[PDB]
Amino acid sequence: MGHHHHHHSHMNSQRLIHIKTLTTPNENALKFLSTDGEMLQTRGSKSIVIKNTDENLINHSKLAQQIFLQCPGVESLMIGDDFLTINKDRMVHWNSIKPEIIDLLTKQLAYGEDVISKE
């Protein structure tokens, strides 16, 4: 008996985290996957769909609050392990949505290693 296992966070000299975004066969959904240093949600969790109507889920994720605030066209999110699937209305284009969300993802991964204080 003696739980002594521990893990420490990253104190780096790299103030930017490269964020990947892959195109899907879907028309209003786009996949943003973290590939550089940090990731959104720890592996072994579920893909949580955060809706603009389901405010309790938004309140859990400061990132979600920033996405719905700065990108008003976003209908819902899906928080995967490594990725985040942004769903928007077809009137609003990714020209405005993507660069803002790349920035917000880099900020979030600089504050905390997990996107959401786990449910």
The two structure tokens encoding residue 111: 């504050």
- How many other CB atoms are there within 10 angstroms of residue 31's CB atom? 17
**What are the C-alpha distances in Å from 78 to residues 44, 85, 102?**
15, 5, 16
* Backbone angles phi and psi of 43, in degrees to 5: -65, 130
Angle at the Cα of 118 (from 115 to 119), degrees rounded to 5? 115
Q: What type of residue sits at position 10?
A: H
The two structure tokens encoding residue 19: 């964020």
Hey, where are the domains in the chain? 1-119
Class of domain 1-119: alpha beta
SS3 for 11? Answer: coil
